Amino acid sequence: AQNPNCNIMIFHPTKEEFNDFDKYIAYMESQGAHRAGLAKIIPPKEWKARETYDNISEILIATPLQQVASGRAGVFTQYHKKKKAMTVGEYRHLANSKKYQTPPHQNFEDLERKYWKNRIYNSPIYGADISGSLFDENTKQWNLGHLGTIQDLLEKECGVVIEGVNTPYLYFGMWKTTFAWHTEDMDLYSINYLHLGEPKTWYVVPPEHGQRLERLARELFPGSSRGCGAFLRHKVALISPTVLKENGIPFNRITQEAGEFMVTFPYGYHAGFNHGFNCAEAINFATPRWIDYGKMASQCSCGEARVTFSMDAFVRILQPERYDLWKRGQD
Numbered sequence: 001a002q003n004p005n006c007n008i009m010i011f012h013p014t015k016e017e018f019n020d021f022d023k024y025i026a027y028m029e030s031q032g033a034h035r036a037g038l039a040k041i042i043p044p045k046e047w048k049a050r051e052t053y054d055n056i057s058e059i060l061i062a063t064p065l066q067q068v069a070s071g072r073a074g075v076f077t078q079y080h081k082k083k084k085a086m087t088v089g090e091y092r093h094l095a096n097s098k099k100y101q102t103p104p105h106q107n108f109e110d111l112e113r114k115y116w117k118n119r120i121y122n123s124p125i126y127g128a129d130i131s132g133s134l135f136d137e138n139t140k141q142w143n144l145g146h147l148g149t150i151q152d153l154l155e156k157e158c159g160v161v162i163e164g165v166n167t168p169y170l171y172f173g174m175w176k177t178t179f180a181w182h183t184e185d186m187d188l189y190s191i192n193y194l195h196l197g198e199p200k201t202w203y204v205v206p207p208e209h210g211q212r213l214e215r216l217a218r219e220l221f222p223g224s225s226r227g228c229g230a231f232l233r234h235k236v237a238l239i240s241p242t243v244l245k246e247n248g249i250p251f252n253r254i255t256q257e258a259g260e261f262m263v264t265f266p267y268g269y270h271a272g273f274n275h276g277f278n279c280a281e282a283i284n285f286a287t288p289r290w291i292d293y294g295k296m297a298s299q300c301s302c303g304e305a306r307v308t309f310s311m312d313a314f315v316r317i318l319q320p321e322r323y324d325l326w327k328r329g330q331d
């Protein structure tokens, strides 16, 4: 088996290899990339997502989210307080303010230490889940707004036609902005392009050891766990590398920089944080290998996780038994 230790692999495709998205994904998986739950793809030096980012201030962040933490430094939940709309310009200015800016630090490692030590005592503001794209339409390779859709994949593989669409989202981050421990909706893949700004650090549990993470989470958030059989779908829980190491949870970490893609793989739990002002674009996608993961994916039926229009049809076709009870949580 390739990559038996489930290490995060880093790919350096040539521009020739960068033309066929699906085939390169299959290539990475032939080399065992998926076992880690996360891979890094450095685009060819000739490739550009767009000409410049000169004009992005005028994007509106309709509902910025203030990420308020509770608990201890290594084990905390966050809640998202809705704030008033602001432009990307205003957000960038806020990110650079003294209150919110990245502190002085020696290197990524020192910054990571400060993140995990000090996260809970601050409440950064995240512009997350903004429908849109920053890829130039003339970018033909690895354009997150022009991927084949999950609905089209489901149709090619299983012959069924469903409603739904699948479009990218932008994320505007600042120092300490956090994405909690999760897998994708329906345990899909995700792909994330860091367009500009400061880095994003990622942590990931190998898909084959996902249940160990879940087991630890039930022990760390025992009431959340009683309330919902798939409470990690709420995307609120954080567990530090230290606490994962202490409980024998296998994981890896890696830092994504501006200009780099990350792909999460089916059932690869991930979490992370931003080093400073940045902008990422991400979208879910599927492959033939996804289909069984989609059939086995846990669902939030407590009603917190409250997910997309398009997810209805995935659950209805792949999880027809769950479909009656799941939609009661989604209605």
Ligand SMILES: O=C(O)CNC(=O)C(=O)O
Pocket (backbone or CB within 6 Å): 128, 171, 178, 179, 190, 191, 192, 264, 270, 280, 282, 283
């Ligand atoms: O970038 C973020 O804040 C969160 N992104 C993801 O969880 C992802 O791309 O799968």
Ligand SMILES: [Mg+2]
Pocket (backbone or CB within 6 Å): 055, 056, 057, 058, 059
């Ligand atoms: Mg603009």
Ligand code: NI
Pocket (backbone or CB within 6 Å): 182, 183, 184, 190, 264, 270
């Ligand atoms: Ni994700």
Ligand SMILES: [Zn+2]
Pocket (backbone or CB within 6 Å): 227, 228, 229, 230, 231, 233, 234, 300, 301, 302, 303, 304, 305
């Ligand atoms: Zn729930």
